[PDB]
Amino acid sequence: HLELTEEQKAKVKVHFDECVKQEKVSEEEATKLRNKDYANPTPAMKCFGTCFFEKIGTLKDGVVQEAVVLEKLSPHFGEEKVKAALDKCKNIKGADRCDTGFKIFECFEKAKDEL
Ligand SMILES: CCCCCCCCCCCCCCCC(=O)O
C-alpha cells in the first residue's frame, strides 16, 4: 500500500480540513474520518470523501481524472494494474454526487483488495 511522503501527509491534512468545512461534516463524523472509520458512512461522510477526491484532482463532476490517478497510484501499484482498476471503476454512478464518489472509491478499494 501507499507509504505517503511527508509532503503528501501535509496535503492530506490540508484537504481534510477543506472538505470538513465544505461538506459541513459534524465533529463526530470528522473524528470517524480521521480514524479511518469508514464502514457504513453517513451521507456527509460520503460527501467528505467525494470532496477529498475532488480536491486532490482525481474526480471532477463524477468523472475520474485518469492522468492524476495514474500519476498518484502507478509508482506503487503498477501502471497496468492502475489502468485495469480505472477500466473497471471509472464509469460507476450512484444516486447523487456524493454517493457516486463513494461508489467509485469502493470500487477502487475492491481493486486494491484483488491485488
Ligand atoms: C490498483 C490500485 C488501486 C489502489 C486504490 C488506493 C486508494 C487510495 C485512497 C487513499 C486515500 C488517502 C488516505 C490518506 C491517509 C492519511 O495519510 O491519513
Ligand SMILES: CCCCCCCCCCCCCCCC(=O)O
Ligand atoms: C473517486 C475515488 C478515486 C480513487 C483513486 C484515487 C487515487 C489517489 C489516492 C491518493 C491518496 C493520497 C493523497 C495524497 C495527498 C494529495 O495528493 O494531495
